[PDB]
Amino acid sequence: SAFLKNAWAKEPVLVVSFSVWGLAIIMPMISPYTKYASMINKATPYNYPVPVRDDGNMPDVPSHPQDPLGPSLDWLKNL
Amino acid sequence: IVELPTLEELKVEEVKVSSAVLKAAAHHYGAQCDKTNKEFMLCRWEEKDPRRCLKEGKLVNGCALNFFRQIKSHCAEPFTEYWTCLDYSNMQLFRHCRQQQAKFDQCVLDKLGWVRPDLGQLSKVTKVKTDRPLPENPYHSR
Amino acid sequence: RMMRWNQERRRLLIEDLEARIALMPLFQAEKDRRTLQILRENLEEEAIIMKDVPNWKVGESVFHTTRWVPPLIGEMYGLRTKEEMSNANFGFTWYT
Amino acid sequence: MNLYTVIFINILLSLTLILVAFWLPQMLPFSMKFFLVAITFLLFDLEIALLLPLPWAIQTIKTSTMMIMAFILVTILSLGLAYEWTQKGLE
Amino acid sequence: MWFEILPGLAIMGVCLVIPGVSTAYIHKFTNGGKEKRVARVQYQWYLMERDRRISGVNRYYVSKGLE
Amino acid sequence: MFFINILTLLVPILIAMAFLTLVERKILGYMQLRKGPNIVGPYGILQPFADAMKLFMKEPMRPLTSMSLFIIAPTLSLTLALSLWVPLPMPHPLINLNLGILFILATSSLSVYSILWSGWASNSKYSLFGALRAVAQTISYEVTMAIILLSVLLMNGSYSLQTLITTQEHMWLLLPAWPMAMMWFISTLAETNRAPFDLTEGESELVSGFNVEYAAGPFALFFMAEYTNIILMNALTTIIFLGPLYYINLPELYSTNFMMEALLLSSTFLWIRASYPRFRYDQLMHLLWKNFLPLTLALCMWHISLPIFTAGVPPYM
Numbered sequence: 019s020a021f022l023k024n025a026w027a028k029e030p031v032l033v034v035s036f037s038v039w040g041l042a043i044i045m046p047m048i049s050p051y052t053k054y055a056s057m058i059n060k061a062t063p064y065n066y067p068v069p070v071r072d073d074g075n076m077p078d079v080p081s082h083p084q085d086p087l088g089p090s091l092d093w094l095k096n097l
Numbered sequence: 098i099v100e101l102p103t104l105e106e107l108k109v110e111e112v113k114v115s116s117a118v119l120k121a122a123a124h125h126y127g128a129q130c131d132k133t134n135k136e137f138m139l140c141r142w143e144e145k146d147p148r149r150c151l152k153e154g155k156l157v158n159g160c161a162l163n164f165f166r167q168i169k170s171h172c173a174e175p176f177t178e179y180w181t182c183l184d185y186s187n188m189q190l191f192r193h194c195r196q197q198q199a200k201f202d203q204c205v206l207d208k209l210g211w212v213r214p215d216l217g218q219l220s221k222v223t224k225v226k227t228d229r230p231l232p233e234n235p236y237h238s239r
Numbered sequence: 240r241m242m243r244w245n246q247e248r249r250r251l252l253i254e255d256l257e258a259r260i261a262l263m264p265l266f267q268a269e270k271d272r273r274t275l276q277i278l279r280e281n282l283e284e285e286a287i288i289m290k291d292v293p294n295w296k297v298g299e300s301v302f303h304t305t306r307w308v309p310p311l312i313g314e315m316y317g318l319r320t321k322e323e324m325s326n327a328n329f330g331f332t333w334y335t
Numbered sequence: 336m337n338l339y340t341v342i343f344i345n346i347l348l349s350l351t352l353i354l355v356a357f358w359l360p361q362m363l364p365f366s367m368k369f370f371l372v373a374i375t376f377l378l379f380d381l382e383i384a385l386l387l388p389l390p391w392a393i394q395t396i397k398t399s400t401m402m403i404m405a406f407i408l409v410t411i412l413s414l415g416l417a418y419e420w421t422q423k424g425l426e
Numbered sequence: 427m428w429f430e431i432l433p434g435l436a437i438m439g440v441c442l443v444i445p446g447v448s449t450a451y452i453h454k455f456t457n458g459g460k461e462k463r464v465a466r467v468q469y470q471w472y473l474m475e476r477d478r479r480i481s482g483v484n485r486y487y488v489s490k491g492l493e
Numbered sequence: 494m495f496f497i498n499i500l501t502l503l504v505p506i507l508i509a510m511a512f513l514t515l516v517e518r519k520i521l522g523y524m525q526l527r528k529g530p531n532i533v534g535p536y537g538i539l540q541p542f543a544d545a546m547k548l549f550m551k552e553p554m555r556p557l558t559s560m561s562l563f564i565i566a567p568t569l570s571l572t573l574a575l576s577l578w579v580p581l582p583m584p585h586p587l588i589n590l591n592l593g594i595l596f597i598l599a600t601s602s603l604s605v606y607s608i609l610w611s612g613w614a615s616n617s618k619y620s621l622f623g624a625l626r627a628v629a630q631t632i633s634y635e636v637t638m639a640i641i642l643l644s645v646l647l648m649n650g651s652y653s654l655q656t657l658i659t660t661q662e663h664m665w666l667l668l669p670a671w672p673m674a675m676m677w678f679i680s681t682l683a684e685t686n687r688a689p690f691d692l693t694e695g696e697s698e699l700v701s702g703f704n705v706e707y708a709a710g711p712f713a714l715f716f717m718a719e720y721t722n723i724i725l726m727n728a729l730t731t732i733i734f735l736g737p738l739y740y741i742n743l744p745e746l747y748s749t750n751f752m753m754e755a756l757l758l759s760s761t762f763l764w765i766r767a768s769y770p771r772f773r774y775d776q777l778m779h780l781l782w783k784n785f786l787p788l789t790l791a792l793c794m795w796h797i798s799l800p801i802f803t804a805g806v807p808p809y810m
């Protein structure tokens with residue numbers, strides 16, 4: 019601890035340096051948002067969503083995507 | 098040989114409107130006319146060849162032209178204002194023009210009855226049952 | 240502020256990607272329709288270029304399969320105007 | 336092409352100036368310590384080259400992986416640097 | 427006093443705004459009053475090209491619902 | 494037109510480049526209790542043009558030196574500087590290089606050749622040492638210079654300098670990332686061999702190794718290059734970290750604001766020069782391989798995690 023103190027006052031870059039190294043190694047693990055990154059990026063519609071053959075027993079979005087069934091991004095909205 | 102289809106076989110009315118025009122009405126077109134398109138997509142995917150879905154493509158085009166004829170007939174002015182402002186921007190970004198968008202969107206809801214699709218609800222995969230025969234042995238697998 | 244701004248910016252990005260998602264069907268048809276035209280048009284000239292050549296099948300898939308192999312850029316614009324070919328070839332690398 | 340046009344004007348403007356300059360007025364080190372630093376440079380430059388792709392990796396659905404991978408890259412190289420210090424190599 | 431360093435600066439400033447205003451009006455003149463389309467990705471070049479074909483030869487000319 | 498847009502964006506910068514030396518020889522003056530050059534012309538406005546004409550007229554001494562390389566280095570220097578101004582994202586940038594920042598980084602690196610080759614070509618001991626010292630400091634400051642940008646980009650989403658105008662529509666990137674601004678500013682001071690970091694031509698310590706033998710026209714071209722750079726790097730600070738206001742309707746405001754911030758930060762390195770003695774060679778490199786590089790590496794991580802744990806990944810447009 020004592021060195022820590024002087025280190026805070028002498029060579030006070032490394033201290034800050036390491037501190038950040040850690041804080042970046044922690045915040046991700048604990049964050050009400052970490053999960054969103056893999057979703058928000060997953061959702062972005064870069065590639066065309068090829069349709070599916072409506073063979074039968076389909077709970078998928080019913081034709082017009084304006085139909086209720088299907089995934090929603092209201093989580094993205096009002097985020 | 099190559100069995101490339103003939104021109105008369107591939108001549109059909111053209112949309113030909115500035116890309117900007119489309120981007121402004123993109124959302125609504127994704128709304129009023131995705132029935133045929135999705136089916137066409139299904140054909141063009143499972144049946145790899147393009148020759149095997151040409152006719153569907155013709156239907157694809159026919160659906161939009163009238164989409165435009167409706168808008169031309171009703172709320173043309175709004176749409177005209179919205180596209181002109183949208184076109185000026187270099188990436189034709191949607192947010193620079195929201196005041197013009199609101200009047201265009203509200204009117205066609207009022208007259209055409211259509212609706213601007215909420216954020217999303219166009220990206221979601223669709224089910225369209227193309228009565229065409231789900232093909233097999235594609236790529237002449239042999 | 241940066242967190243909120245990029246989250247908004249992301250919402251705008253999903254909005255316009257979906258805008259093309261909706262419009263590509265109209266373009267896909269257009270592309271194919273035009274693509275075939277270029278192939279066919281080249282067929283006409285093809286049926287007029289090597290006619291004299293002996294043992295000259297007007298045209299034949301370089302391959303054996305009858306599967307639809309998309310047309311390379313060269314094939315589409317090779318016979319066509321040089322500029323046309325150049326445009327396609329070096330027309331993106333060179334900005335608008 | 337547009338860039339090519341600009342650049343050749345850029346060289347032309349310079350070459351014009353040097354020429355004017357010449358035509359108008361007619362009237363053994365032992366950097367061993369450095370050597371080491373130079374090598375580290377090479378190495379660090381290469382890492383940076385492996386860190387350049389991040390701007391697109393940030394988009395990876397596998398965000399977590401990207402984090403772990405990236406974090407490791409920086410950390411490992413950081414360790415290399417520290418060693419230099421620990422072994423007093425650079426000093 | 428220090429009043430005098432300003433003359434020189436004025437001629438620097440004026441010579442650093444020209445470029446930014448110039449490049450940003452020789453674009454809106456050549457592109458028909460509409461900002462030069464920035465085609466970062468092909469889609470955009472496609473849309474741009476599509477525009478060319480749609481009318482005249484230049485993409486800046488833009489046909490509308492009345493076509 | 495495009496040609497006209499090449500005159501503008503070049504001449505204007507060259508004329509401004511000339512007026513920087515003047516505003517350097519007067520701002521340093523008033524800080525040191527002296528008027529500076531006001532007697533030639535009105536208030537010294539004709540002073541930059543005057544020595545340019547003297548420099549070109551005086552004999553270009555060719556020491557008894559590898560001629561080709563000796564003459565090429567100046568050419569490269571100016572070529573690179575003028576070139577680096579092509580993709581700058583003042584509104585509607587001359588050329589939307591999609592990976593512009595990379596381009597800037599690339600050309601900036603090539604400049605090192607000039608100093609290195611110049612020293613080798615000069616064939617004088619002073620010059621040789623100057624080159625060696627220069628290459629080392631230059632490249633090293635490049636290593637933190639590049640990492641500092643990579644941290645920025647990851648919060649911008651792309652390498653294109655045009656994106657930052659949309660990233661900085663609500664707040665400057667100084668507020669966030671100020672710790673790197675400082676480290677970008679100090680690195681911008683090293684890469685333009687300006688004062689605090691000017692061991693390349695210390696004059697007192699070693700006598701102008703870079704151009705020991707260079708005089709007249711060659712002296713001028715690098716010379717011009719350095720000062721144009723002095724501006725360019727300051728301008729990159731004024732786009733990447735201090736984001737000027739921008740309005741699509743009125744694109745001029747950006748240029749005007751860009752002007753004000755560029756001139757003030759250009760004024761700052763003038764002010765730094767008069768105010769500080771010069772760092773030693775060893776001290777200089779220590780600061781970067783020791784005082785900064787560890788700072789720059791760590792924050793890179795923080796800027797990798799920041800977006801994720803804040804779900805603040807930027808759009809790729």
Ligand SMILES: CCCCCCCCCCCCCCCCCC(=O)OC[C@H](COP(=O)(O)OCCN)OC(=O)CCCCCCCCCCCCCCCCC
Nearest residue numbers: 029030031034038672674675676678679689730765784795
């Ligand atoms: C938590 C999330 C993550 C974020 C964490 C943030 C934590 C708080 C920020 C911590 C770091 C803040 C400062 C960053 C830059 C300074 C980095 C540094 O450590 O300085 C090195 C060096 C001083 O080192 P020295 O005095 O030799 O002693 C070393 C002791 N280890 O510095 C120098 O010697 C510099 C010498 C400069 C000479 C010219 C000075 C010019 C001064 C005026 C301009 C200043 C910059 C203006 C920038 C404008 C905008 C770009």
